[PDB]
Ligand binder design. Sequence first.
Ligand SMILES: OC[C@H]1CN[C@H](O)[C@@H](O)[C@@H]1O
Ligand SMILES: [Br-]
Ligand SMILES: [Br-]
Ligand SMILES: [Br-]
Ligand SMILES: [Br-]
Ligand SMILES: [Br-]
Ligand SMILES: [Br-]
Ligand SMILES: [Br-]
Ligand SMILES: [Cl-]
Ligand SMILES: [Cl-]
Ligand SMILES: [Cl-]
Length: 836
Amino acid sequence: NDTSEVMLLDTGWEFSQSGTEKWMPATVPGTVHQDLISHELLPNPFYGMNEKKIQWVENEDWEYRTSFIVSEEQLNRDGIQLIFEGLDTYADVYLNGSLLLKADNMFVGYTLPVKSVLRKGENHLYIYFHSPIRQTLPQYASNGFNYPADNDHHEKHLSVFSRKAPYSYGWDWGIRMVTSGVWRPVTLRFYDIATISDYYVRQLSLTDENARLSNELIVNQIVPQKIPAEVRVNVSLNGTTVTEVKQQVTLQPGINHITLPAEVTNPVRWMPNGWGTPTLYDFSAQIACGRIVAEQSHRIGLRTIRVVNEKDKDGESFYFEVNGIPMFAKGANYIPQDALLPNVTTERYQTLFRDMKEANMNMVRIWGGGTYENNLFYDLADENGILVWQDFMFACTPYPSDPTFLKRVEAEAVYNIRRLRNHASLAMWCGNNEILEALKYWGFEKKFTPEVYQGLMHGYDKLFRELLPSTVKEFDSDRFYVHSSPYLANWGRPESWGTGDSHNWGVWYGKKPFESLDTDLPRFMSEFGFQSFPEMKTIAAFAAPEDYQIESEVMNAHQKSSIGNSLIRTYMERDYIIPESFEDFVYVGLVLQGQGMRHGLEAHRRNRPYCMGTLYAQLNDSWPVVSWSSIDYYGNWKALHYQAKRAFAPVLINPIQQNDSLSVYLISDRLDTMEQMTLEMKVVDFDGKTLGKKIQVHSLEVPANTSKCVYRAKLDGWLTPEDCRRSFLKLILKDKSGHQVAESVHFFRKTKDLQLPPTSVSYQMKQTDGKCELTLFSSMLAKDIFIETPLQGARYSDNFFDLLPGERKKVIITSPRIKKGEELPVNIKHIRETYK
Ligand SMILES: OC[C@H]1CN[C@H](O)[C@@H](O)[C@@H]1O
Ligand SMILES: [Br-]
Ligand SMILES: [Br-]
Ligand SMILES: [Br-]
Ligand SMILES: [Br-]
Ligand SMILES: [Br-]
Ligand SMILES: [Br-]
Ligand SMILES: [Br-]
Ligand SMILES: [Cl-]
Ligand SMILES: [Cl-]
Ligand SMILES: [Cl-]
């Protein structure tokens, strides 16, 4: 780094309910809710009916205080800067009798010059958080109408007035915890001469032969004199200098703009997950005043990302081109990982990225009702090769567009754009989630006067068609912006499906069968989804045995969608026998969500290039709840996660059966063509015996980045209705020499129509520290087996798979909490067991 010193204001904090004069220890970064919980002043907010029991917190004001020492020597540094990375939300900040700041935007980092107010010895920092509810009640009263924000779970929809995480007020998968606090870190920096307020590595061009960069620095000089300095940029890879440039300047008091070109010959490109290595250069800029007074570095990925959104014969395309190659996007919508943001640990972020990488994903949407994520989130996306689609934090309701609200939004857009624009992973900006769809199709025209509706339509344009796009054009001029997701397509209107991106909620809200995903195709799927109850160990975190019915108060409850638990039963009944026990119903509901959802994922990939991506709703959960998530709050992979992994495999054999006939497609996202390939298939009954003979299709090629049909056959004359109920299709793809590159299994009937034999999955266990190895055997098919353990967060090599007749299967379960001796409890479930 440089000669500055940083003091972390992360200890010795206390908090108070205002007007009580009672102080208790606090943890910062943190939240009022966690501080109370930690003194047993709230029940577990996630347990039972306890949501209503914690609401009172949002009606109180909350105070925070800390003290720190400053030395005579520190006070003699040229400048001293206090930085709040995050204040939630209406925060009056006092230091040593000075009001430093009236903060009003959760999404903004505040940098404050404090030398002239600090004192040798003890220094006293106090922060007063006004209730976001009481702060905005007068605002609402003056408004004359209630914004149609159905996700804001209160009679008055105050959320829209505050630049605060929309989901904190509730959501259709979320608990209401309208929290407050110092949500990101506080630092004091003691420094000489200047600081680097911004360092932007702007890529000018990239070819195989050369990368041209422009290093753009904003330097804030704090002393009264003009100061000769040399600006230096070092570009290194893996600890070795690649290129180095320097510039003489004389820094003036105040802001200085410094621009140094640099080039990297024969650059090593950053590639997305599945296409190579996510190579990151180290770019370091230093200010040297004959000592390095200031330094700032960024990890930089050298790549092009173009979003192609052009009129074509099919409507309007919507796809991503990476390093000149169209890349079919495979991923999911990401939501905040906790009701209480500072509770989400480094480990939890690293684990989530591991989950995305291991599921073969190359894209995550940071959906617009959460937060602009922390720097760590983006750093991990950079180093895992995952593209980031970044919504601005507007979701599902129109918002105000008065001048002072828009000045607030402008502050947050400039802050986060400059914060995020150096990440290799950042791929596009999206003005909002679902707001134009909402304005057009959600029945507002009957909920408000014409003049108010006109006001809302004009407000939409001010923010999402003017302010936000101009801010991106200014500060991130080479990145794509689109005003809303979905921008035109609506799920109820087939005429619009060829136009940009879709949120197909035909499945779920429109009750369409999963098979509808085969015919109802988008140019890009930015949302589609299906709910499930999480597994029992998670339920046991939030419900009691008495509450084990699909619509008791508690489940209902932990159901926040406008049609809920009943829909899960409705869909289940189409394809499965509904089990009589709750635990069995939970198991099949996981299998259900997995099988139906992967059917869509497959349909989207199969239909490339018409469709160029699929991002399911949703990756993750913020609390224990029944949701569209593929990984529950405790990090347990649902069926859907293993199925998404399978559906996103770089090479996939996709058998698709419709109108009593089978097609097999070979789908590849590899960058190289596969030549001289052999598809081989056979029908095997549930006892292990082959029906007929092996079918072989030789001489197959799988070109890079294509989906292609290689086999078709009518069922009639091949299999009888009886066989379709009592066998499966095994499929394998192999190269010239017989090496297997891909396999699949196909069933010819719905699971409820299968004549599944009673059967026992036996296993042998070899348990050590951290590790559990199981070998599973069944003489007969066991359908969609779930290997269930009580260890929260335990990870599995595979799970939610069919255990084929006779064919042994190795599964490894890992967890730091696995001890040698202490045999891991294991419960193996499968479909036939769920009914008599
Ligand atoms: O109700 C399910 C989803 C519909 N689309 C929204 O963007 C998302 O936040 C919702 O959870
Ligand atoms: Br200062
Ligand atoms: Br400053
Ligand atoms: Br200047
Ligand atoms: Br990829
Ligand atoms: Br952070
Ligand atoms: Br626009
Ligand atoms: Br069929
Ligand atoms: Cl960065
Ligand atoms: Cl009105
Ligand atoms: Cl099928």
